[PDB]
Amino acid sequence: FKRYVEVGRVVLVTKGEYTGKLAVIVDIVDHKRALIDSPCSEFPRQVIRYGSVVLTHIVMKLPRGARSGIVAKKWKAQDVCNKWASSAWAKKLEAKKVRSQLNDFDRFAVMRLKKQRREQVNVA
Amino acid sequence: AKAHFVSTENNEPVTLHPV
Amino acid sequence: AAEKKSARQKKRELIAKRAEAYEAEYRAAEREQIELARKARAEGNYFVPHEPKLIFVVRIRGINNIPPKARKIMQLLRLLQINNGIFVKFNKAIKEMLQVVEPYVTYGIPNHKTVRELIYKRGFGKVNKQRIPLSDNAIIEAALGKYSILSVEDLIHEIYTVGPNFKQAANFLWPFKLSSPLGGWRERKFKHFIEGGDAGKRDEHINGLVQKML
Amino acid sequence: AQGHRLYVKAKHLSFQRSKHVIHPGTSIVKIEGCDSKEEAQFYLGKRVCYVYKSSKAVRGSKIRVIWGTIARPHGNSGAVRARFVHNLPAKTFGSSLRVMLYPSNI
Amino acid sequence: VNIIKKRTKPFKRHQSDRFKRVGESWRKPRGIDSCVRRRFRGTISMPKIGYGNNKKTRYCMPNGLKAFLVRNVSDVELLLMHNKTYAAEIAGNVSARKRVEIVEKARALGVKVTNAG
Amino acid sequence: FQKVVVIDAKGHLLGRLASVVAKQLLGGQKVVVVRCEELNISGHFFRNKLKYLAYLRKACAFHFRAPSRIFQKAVRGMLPHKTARGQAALEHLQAVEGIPPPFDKQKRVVVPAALRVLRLKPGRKYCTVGRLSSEVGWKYNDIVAKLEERRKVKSAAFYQAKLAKQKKIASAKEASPVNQKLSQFGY
Amino acid sequence: AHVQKKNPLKNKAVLSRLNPYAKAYKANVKINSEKTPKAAGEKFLSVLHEN
Amino acid sequence: ALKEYQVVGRKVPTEHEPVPKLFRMRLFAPNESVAKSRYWYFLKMINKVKKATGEIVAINEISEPKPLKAKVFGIWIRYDSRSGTHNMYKEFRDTTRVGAVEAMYADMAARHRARFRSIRILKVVEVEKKEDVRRNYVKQLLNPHLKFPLPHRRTGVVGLAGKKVFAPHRPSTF
RNA sequence: GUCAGCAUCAGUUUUCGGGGGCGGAAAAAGAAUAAGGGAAGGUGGCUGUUUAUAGCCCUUGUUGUAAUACGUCCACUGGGGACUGAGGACUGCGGCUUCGUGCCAAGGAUGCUGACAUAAUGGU
RNA sequence: CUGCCGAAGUUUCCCUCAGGAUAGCAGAAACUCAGAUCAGUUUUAUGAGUAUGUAAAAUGAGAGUUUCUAGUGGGCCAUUUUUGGUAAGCAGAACUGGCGAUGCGGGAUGAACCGAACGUGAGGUUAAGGUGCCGGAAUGUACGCUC
């Protein structure tokens, strides 16, 4: 059980309008409701259940019930940003995300990109 | 019924609960 | 020719002036009602607002298996078909009017928008014992000219404000024939509204329902 | 090999029916990929064909096509309702359909 | 104005299929438990006045002409006024000699003949 | 929606897999199930036995006993098998024992909506159709187990050859200088 | 006369015909400003947040 | 969705009773109209003031003052059953006063199959002191060292697709 | 002739979106920033303590003439999809005109184009 | 053959006998007031005992009349009291409806249950009932209980 609900663990919301945004558990209301927040202005603090989220490995030290400003101070101090991106798990998500907003011309260049990648097939 | 004001001076409301 | 053009112009100018007179009163009506609560709440004093002289009643149950006492009442309020709905003068003699057929009708207090939409989109006047639509103001005048009602807005004003000629105007209005609401009702529609159903007094929520029924 | 197929596959599920009455006037089409009632808003209005064959060689082709239009979404899972020029025969329940991308909206 | 027919299939008397003694012609049932008279599910449909066709397109062939039965050439002379709305139909017992006289006369008068062959 | 698909049945629930399968058959998809022995039923083993001895007690029927024949019975109850719509939908469903050779070389998909782990609370009693039927009159429990082991040997051996092969292409993938442009397109 | 009924709430020409004031109505009225005078009785607030 | 409703009203003044007393109630209702109905029911069964001689002076809705602050709520209720009288006192820990009552309606109709009309809310109070709390699971939930894996592991991430019939790989679910 | 394709419209209708009023505790929140108070599920420190090498809660000020939600409303606007095209010289109600002119979404559908006749519809 | 209209299913009496009735319901013709004339409605005022009757504003509707001519005077189901009852059913009335002349959706199937009254079609939208599959529609959301 490396995924462990701990005060201050980072969570990644997978359902609801804030899908994909990172946030950190602040206080454990109950086994079905929790309080999370993020310094990112697009994410207002709210009481979110456990059904829409999957627990992440990264855990940052955080005193219970910290306000958003203190949480922002703790996050910026602990450089959690770009520490999540260090994981190989993260790198795949935007790789899926970047492929989402491609257009036809970008797709064709990818076809040029991968075709030039495959032609080598050089094996000793 | 017509609109009127219900003065609360010396008529303060105390909360109620069932029994 | 020119004389009727002047008659057209002056009469049209009068209707515009009357309409702006009503809406000016309409805006002034809500403004004070907001200031009344604002002043009362600032003082800590409590304010109760005026009673509603207007009630809109929609029949929600069909003509099968209805007691004769309730059948006659529906005949008086002219709700001969399911989904029909008429304007009634909300008074004391209508309190029990809507208690006997309490399970068969949902009724509530209409705001300005609901009264406006219903006549504009569903406005048919009982003219010469016929259901002639209010395509133009001449139809209303040819029927309600005596009561100083000329255009639709005057007719809307006489209804919303519940004027001296409320009876004649609402009697002139053929019972609005509405469509089964878009999105549907609650599951158990035939329970009382306060109990999670959709029958009976739902207060302002008629204004949240008639939008579905148009 | 994959230099064709400018349409989207589908299946003629059934008629838009009550419990005990079929209304053959409008069919039900499940586009291969549609997964929501908001999703079907894209496929509304497109043209859908049912391609079958017969022994008669009309104009040098055993192949016949019955045209149709996607009309509105059906249900919460992404099936739509289609109104074909000829009501699709009852024997094509489960058969394959093509929802070609035109008339477009982009 | 075009033609729309509210119903194409004819009306067949109930159980007409089952019996040869029962004609294929409509007679209204009179039983008090007759599912046909009580209009149950999947039963045959009784003729009503609701099925009546449009007045402006009634007694009209799919080419918009009302069939006027013609016995001799003096009847075709009557359709002189109404070549644009009535179609001359030859009576079935008119001999070959008269029939060609009518068809040639109708062709001269511009009156369509339904069964010119 | 491929024309032919293969559903591995190990760990799937008999009732909830059948309801998914019965619908796909009526859609026209040729569904083939494999490893029908390892299906599961909610309820302890002895309970599902007794509900089966009622089936054998019901007699004039043909109480088919093999695990595939148990599943085929489950699907036949969710099809309109009296009509030619379902009578022609039943014949597409091919349920087999284990994995015959013409299917052990095909990719086997699993139904997320009817797996045992996702649908049963932890610790809940359940039974395996293969074990159950082998105690009702089936006589081929041992032979399919031996045959399945042999195929597992060949399949595992096949992976090791493929694992090294893809490792070679895994090692030679970075040699492409277009990897930077691959990163820019997120691919 | 009146072959059809055209919806006044969707047909502008019919709307102007029926109501010759819809031409100049000016719905969204800037009656307030940023200068909203928050007015609430303190005793009202206390009795509001009671119990 | 319930709302807090401070409902204040009094009987109709008359020559016998020129100054009626303003009663107050903090009762819950899905809309304003239901609040009136519950008000008349709550008061008439108790104080015997007739409907037709009563008017209501003010309906207000009370937003949660500090919704973001986790709290423990004490809820005195009266069960109505075959007997019709049970002094039950439940406790729930959550963020909003309305949310606690919702769960109390959820539990009362689930654990005990109660009905909204039958159940009358007696008093809802905040429990600011852990010592004042009386429930072991709440006491355990109030401990300084709370820690537990996310229960119902499958409910996390569920399947995460639109219509994912025939997934090509087994789900880890761990 | 038959059948398609599109455009602008009219009637009914469904479906997403943008902008803007007004109301609520003139939303509650919250943030930032000054006071005071309190403590913990007690942090640094030393089981016990009061912001220190974490912080938290309460009251007020202030950034505030705050945002948002929610409710309501706009005779404010962007689209997408479907069914229907009845009536058949002109009158009428209106709007822009241009004060002869006319025009118009205003007392119910027209314009452009393509394909087929050994076909396509339709009928048995 | 199509169309229109359309009941009563019961009092009243007379009556040795079977019935006869008058009335009601259904119609057809001839004549008044443009009415405050009626209403399976409720109010206003009561009077007496929360109910009861009575007379005197709300709402809807055009309300009337004299004359004749059919058909009918069964029963079933469920509610109210109810007096007499007991292992327990019951037994008895008074009363109220609906079915009886009526298709339709739902209730797996159905005389009375839940919805709904039917010209012929098009679209839209609902009721009751529902959305695992047969079967049209979420193997939806949330919180719980049960081996």
Side-chain angles (χ1 to χ4, degrees):
Chain A
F1 293 150
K2 315 190 305 171
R3 320 293 173 82
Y4 224 146
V5 177
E6 271 296 80
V7 182
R9 185 175 282 260
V10 187
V11 317
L12 173 46
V13 177
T14 83
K15 287 204 196 305
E17 51 255 20
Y18 305 123
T19 292
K21 300 285 194 305
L22 267 187
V24 55
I25 165 62
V26 183
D27 173 18
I28 316 175
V29 180
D30 185 322
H31 305 280
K32 299 296 175 68
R33 285 138 69 74
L35 184 42
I36 88 164
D37 198 342
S38 172
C40 289
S41 64
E42 59 271 36
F43 199 109
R45 189 184 286 259
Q46 46 71 351
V47 199
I48 169 56
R49 300 177 168 275
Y50 303 90
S52 70
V53 73
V54 60
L55 268 309
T56 56
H57 306 100
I58 164 176
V59 182
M60 52 99 69
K61 165 65 162 57
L62 198 39
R64 181 263 295 261
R67 304 312 199 77
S68 71
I70 288 94
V71 160
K73 175 199 148 202
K74 275 299 165 40
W75 183 331
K76 193 62 67 182
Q78 298 201 39
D79 84 294
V80 152
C81 293
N82 309 138
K83 182 168 283 188
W84 170 59
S86 58
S87 155
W89 184 16
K91 301 164 167 51
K92 300 172 174 295
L93 327 180
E94 322 69 11
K96 165 180 66 191
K97 188 46 196 174
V98 167
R99 286 178 292 186
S100 80
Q101 84 282 21
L102 294 178
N103 81 0
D104 214 0
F105 183 71
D106 324 316
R107 271 182 258 112
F108 191 35
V110 157
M111 158 163 171
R112 289 307 169 203
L113 255 54
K114 65 164 69 174
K115 187 174 278 190
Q116 283 157 352
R117 177 181 68 183
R118 188 254 293 143
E119 55 191 68
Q120 44 95 25
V121 280
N122 292 129
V123 280
Chain B
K2 290 285 102 177
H4 41 56
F5 280 84
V6 315
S7 317
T8 165
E9 192 180 3
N10 307 306
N11 206 358
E12 266 326 275
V14 290
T15 165
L16 271 43
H17 330 121
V19 191
Chain C
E3 59 275 15
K4 66 171 301 304
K5 177 73 66 177
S6 59
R8 184 211 201 171
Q9 273 314 80
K10 284 191 288 293
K11 274 287 309 302
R12 194 168 182 84
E13 286 141 19
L14 187 63
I15 291 164
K17 259 68 172 178
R18 278 186 181 168
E20 81 193 359
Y22 304 142
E23 61 97 30
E25 196 278 337
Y26 289 168
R27 302 184 207 275
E30 297 106 20
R31 283 292 104 201
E32 49 88 8
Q33 286 297 275
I34 292 152
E35 95 183 4
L36 261 289
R38 275 171 176 178
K39 181 261 286 197
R41 188 204 321 122
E43 286 172 8
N45 194 352
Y46 294 10
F47 160 77
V48 55
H50 322 77
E51 82 93 32
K53 294 142 291 303
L54 216 172
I55 183 55
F56 189 63
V57 51
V58 193
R59 168 171 208 173
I60 65 164
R61 191 146 180 113
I63 83 164
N64 281 127
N65 289 25
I66 35 177
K69 194 65 48 202
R71 300 180 75 266
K72 171 59 60 216
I73 285 286
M74 295 326 270
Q75 259 194 326
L76 290 189
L77 317 169
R78 303 197 294 173
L79 309 177
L80 285 320
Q81 212 182 16
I82 165 172
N83 295 333
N84 273 121
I86 55 141
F87 295 123
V88 190
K89 178 158 182 161
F90 197 18
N91 72 59
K92 173 305 193 175
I94 320 294
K95 290 294 302 276
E96 88 288 9
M97 263 312 88
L98 311 183
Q99 283 204 150
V100 281
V101 316
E102 178 31 16
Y104 307 146
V105 291
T106 178
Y107 58 92
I109 40 177
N111 59 351
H112 171 230
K113 183 193 196 199
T114 278
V115 179
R116 191 146 186 278
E117 301 185 0
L118 273 185
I119 294 185
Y120 265 109
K121 186 174 188 290
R122 293 274 163 96
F124 295 72
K126 174 189 169 192
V127 191
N128 304 101
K129 302 297 199 68
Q130 280 190 341
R131 193 192 182 258
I132 306 306
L134 308 182
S135 53
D136 213 318
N137 301 313
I139 280 167
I140 330 181
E141 162 192 22
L144 310 189
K146 276 83 63 173
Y147 313 126
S148 42
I149 287 298
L150 283 178
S151 78
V152 189
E153 181 56 350
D154 325 304
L155 183 49
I156 282 170
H157 157 82
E158 190 79 25
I159 283 296
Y160 190 21
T161 66
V162 198
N165 295 128
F166 177 84
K167 167 172 192 169
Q168 295 84 65
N171 185 58
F172 159 84
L173 280 174
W174 198 283
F176 304 113
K177 282 162 79 67
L178 313 158
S179 161
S180 275
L182 168 63
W185 310 72
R186 289 169 185 159
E187 181 55 271
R188 278 266 77 75
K189 154 200 169 177
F190 281 124
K191 297 174 325 183
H192 202 298
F193 173 76
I194 66 179
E195 286 327 272
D198 273 299
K201 174 60 141 75
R202 55 163 63 214
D203 194 316
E204 65 85 25
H205 290 87
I206 277 284
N207 299 296
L209 168 80
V210 169
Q211 331 293 129
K212 300 177 178 201
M213 271 205 208
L214 269 154
Chain D
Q2 48 272 8
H4 311 87
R5 211 278 288 266
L6 311 156
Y7 54 80
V8 190
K9 298 172 308 319
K11 302 191 142 302
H12 170 225
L13 289 194
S14 80
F15 299 132
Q16 169 256 350
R17 62 186 283 178
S18 173
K19 194 158 167 293
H20 288 299
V21 186
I22 49 138
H23 284 282
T26 174
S27 300
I28 293 152
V29 196
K30 184 187 136 34
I31 301 80
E32 303 291 341
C34 202
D35 43 358
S36 303
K37 60 155 199 290
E38 319 273 338
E39 282 256 19
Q41 281 301 316
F42 177 70
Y43 298 124
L44 253 59
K46 313 299 227 169
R47 185 100 75 79
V48 50
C49 68
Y50 152 72
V51 182
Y52 64 91
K53 52 100 173 183
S54 58
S55 173
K56 274 184 81 101
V58 46
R59 208 38 207 173
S61 277
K62 306 301 176 64
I63 283 170
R64 294 153 206 280
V65 156
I66 286 176
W67 279 130
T69 301
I70 305 301
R72 66 177 304 176
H74 189 74
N76 279 308
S77 305
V80 299
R81 303 198 214 163
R83 221 163 290 96
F84 298 83
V85 159
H86 296 130
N87 310 15
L88 280 192
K91 52 189 212 193
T92 84
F93 286 179
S95 193
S96 200
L97 269 59
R98 321 167 166 197
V99 175
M100 316 146 197
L101 271 161
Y102 66 101
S104 164
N105 204 17
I106 196 164
Chain E
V1 179
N2 65 331
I3 310 282
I4 277 290
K5 263 165 49 192
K6 285 212 211 150
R7 172 195 182 77
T8 293
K9 282 271 302 320
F11 281 104
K12 300 257 266 183
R13 190 197 168 170
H14 191 237
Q15 300 222 66
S16 90
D17 49 36
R18 264 302 300 92
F19 291 105
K20 199 77 164 47
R21 73 205 199 228
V22 173
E24 264 47 62
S25 149
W26 173 248
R27 309 272 169 278
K28 159 74 145 317
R30 318 271 182 209
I32 40 170
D33 70 6
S34 174
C35 297
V36 181
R37 181 180 88 71
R38 288 187 190 278
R39 321 164 151 224
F40 269 113
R41 306 182 60 165
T43 52
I44 82 165
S45 76
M46 291 152 85
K48 309 172 190 69
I49 202 70
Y51 287 89
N53 267 310
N54 189 327
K55 282 210 264 179
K56 303 208 314 212
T57 83
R58 215 202 180 210
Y59 306 98
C60 273
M61 318 172 49
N63 67 79
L65 298 176
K66 301 152 181 45
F68 185 60
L69 199 77
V70 152
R71 316 253 189 201
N72 58 15
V73 306
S74 55
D75 294 17
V76 156
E77 305 267 322
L78 257 287
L79 300 141
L80 176 88
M81 211 30 45
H82 319 114
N83 74 326
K84 201 39 94 193
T85 169
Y86 290 58
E89 172 154 27
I90 306 311
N93 47 9
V94 177
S95 47
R97 56 181 342 146
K98 282 226 193 298
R99 256 177 77 104
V100 310
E101 264 176 13
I102 312 169
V103 178
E104 301 255 30
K105 163 67 47 193
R107 184 221 291 201
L109 291 203
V111 183
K112 324 312 291 303
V113 189
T114 36
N115 58 341
Chain F
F1 271 30
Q2 314 85 60
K3 285 135 190 156
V4 52
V5 80
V6 183
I7 296 193
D8 177 278
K10 196 255 297 185
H12 286 78
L13 278 156
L14 172 87
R16 291 182 182 273
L17 173 74
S19 176
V20 163
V21 157
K23 189 62 160 197
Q24 299 310 115
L25 275 285
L26 293 176
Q29 193 183 15
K30 198 171 324 295
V31 152
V32 180
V33 182
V34 296
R35 255 201 287 182
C36 282
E37 311 66 19
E38 303 274 50
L39 281 177
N40 290 312
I41 312 166
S42 54
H44 55 282
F45 158 68
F46 194 31
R47 167 167 204 77
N48 314 127
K49 179 79 73 59
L50 268 282
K51 287 182 212 142
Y52 209 92
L53 294 324
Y55 186 21
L56 322 177
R57 182 200 295 289
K58 306 307 184 288
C60 287
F62 295 75
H63 316 123
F64 282 79
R65 291 177 175 87
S68 70
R69 280 326 306 252
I70 270 174
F71 181 79
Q72 279 197 264
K73 168 195 188 289
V75 191
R76 175 151 71 52
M78 298 165 203
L79 295 158
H81 68 102
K82 296 303 190 91
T83 187
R85 171 193 154 157
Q87 189 107 322
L90 188 73
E91 40 154 59
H92 299 285
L93 163 77
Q94 278 113 3
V96 302
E97 301 325 330
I99 317 107
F103 301 103
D104 61 20
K105 301 162 69 63
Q106 318 283 339
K107 176 68 163 65
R108 300 169 281 267
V109 304
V110 307
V111 174
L115 287 172
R116 174 172 70 81
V117 285
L118 278 79
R119 195 47 56 159
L120 288 191
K121 274 202 301 299
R124 274 278 171 276
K125 296 286 186 276
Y126 64 92
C127 171
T128 39
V129 165
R131 163 203 176 164
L132 181 163
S133 159
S134 162
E135 281 146 289
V136 180
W138 209 41
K139 25 169 72 173
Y140 299 97
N141 178 359
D142 75 38
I143 169 55
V144 299
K146 169 168 71 63
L147 284 175
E148 286 214 58
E149 181 56 299
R150 165 183 308 284
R151 178 202 68 85
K152 285 181 207 287
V153 165
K154 277 166 66 175
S155 58
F158 169 60
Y159 194 11
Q160 298 286 348
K162 189 165 79 72
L163 183 84
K165 176 250 289 183
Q166 56 87 27
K167 273 286 191 181
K168 261 74 180 171
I169 220 64
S171 47
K173 180 63 75 175
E174 39 277 36
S176 82
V178 303
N179 269 83
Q180 179 52 258
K181 295 166 289 302
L182 268 276
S183 54
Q184 149 280 338
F185 272 134
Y187 210 150
Chain G
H2 174 279
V3 66
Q4 201 171 28
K5 177 189 176 66
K6 289 173 190 272
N7 199 344
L9 307 191
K10 297 194 279 203
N11 201 317
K12 297 306 169 295
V14 164
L15 173 58
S16 293
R17 158 155 73 91
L18 269 302
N19 204 351
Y21 177 46
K23 184 74 154 285
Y25 172 94
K26 155 43 170 63
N28 295 331
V29 277
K30 297 264 100 171
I31 62 165
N32 289 131
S33 306
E34 189 84 22
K35 163 56 210 80
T36 59
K38 176 113 153 190
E42 182 69 30
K43 85 212 67 57
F44 168 87
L45 202 173
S46 65
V47 76
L48 185 74
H49 305 157
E50 186 183 2
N51 198 359
Chain H
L2 290 193
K3 298 174 192 171
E4 208 94 357
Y5 276 104
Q6 146 199 68
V7 168
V8 279
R10 41 172 200 68
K11 76 181 80 68
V12 155
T14 182
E15 63 273 18
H16 307 357
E17 214 279 327
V19 47
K21 184 262 177 194
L22 274 79
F23 312 98
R24 174 175 179 269
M25 271 285 268
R26 284 176 69 104
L27 67 163
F28 306 70
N31 57 67
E32 63 267 2
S33 306
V34 168
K36 282 97 177 174
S37 315
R38 291 301 292 172
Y39 164 83
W40 282 128
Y41 166 87
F42 262 120
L43 169 149
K44 162 81 81 156
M45 288 335 99
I46 295 312
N47 184 274
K48 319 302 290 181
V49 154
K50 278 37 187 156
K51 283 85 67 179
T53 181
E55 77 302 342
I56 308 206
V57 303
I59 307 330
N60 320 320
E61 66 284 31
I62 317 88
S63 309
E64 181 85 30
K66 307 296 190 181
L68 276 306
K69 179 172 59 183
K71 286 163 294 189
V72 173
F73 286 72
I75 319 85
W76 290 88
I77 79 147
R78 289 283 277 171
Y79 211 138
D80 192 326
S81 290
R82 317 163 193 164
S83 76
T85 165
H86 312 268
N87 224 27
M88 211 162 322
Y89 167 43
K90 285 286 298 298
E91 295 91 330
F92 303 110
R93 165 178 151 77
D94 69 328
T95 57
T96 326
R97 193 180 274 101
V98 193
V101 181
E102 287 270 335
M104 182 305 297
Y105 283 147
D107 213 29
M108 215 49 178
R111 289 191 185 278
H112 311 330
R113 321 297 168 153
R115 300 297 163 165
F116 174 76
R117 169 264 317 161
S118 54
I119 168 58
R120 57 176 166 91
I121 181 46
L122 201 43
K123 175 164 205 333
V124 158
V125 80
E126 318 277 344
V127 189
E128 67 279 17
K129 294 299 293 182
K130 179 174 168 64
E131 295 79 11
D132 201 6
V133 178
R134 316 199 221 169
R135 260 69 206 160
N136 183 31
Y137 49 94
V138 187
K139 282 275 199 181
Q140 174 277 133
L141 273 173
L142 267 282
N143 68 342
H145 213 56
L146 209 42
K147 46 193 292 297
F148 54 93
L150 182 137
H152 329 74
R153 38 151 181 73
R154 180 261 149 183
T155 56
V157 69
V158 281
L160 197 167
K163 287 296 208 81
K164 206 205 268 177
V165 193
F166 302 169
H169 300 299
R170 296 262 164 164
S172 83
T173 279
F174 176 58

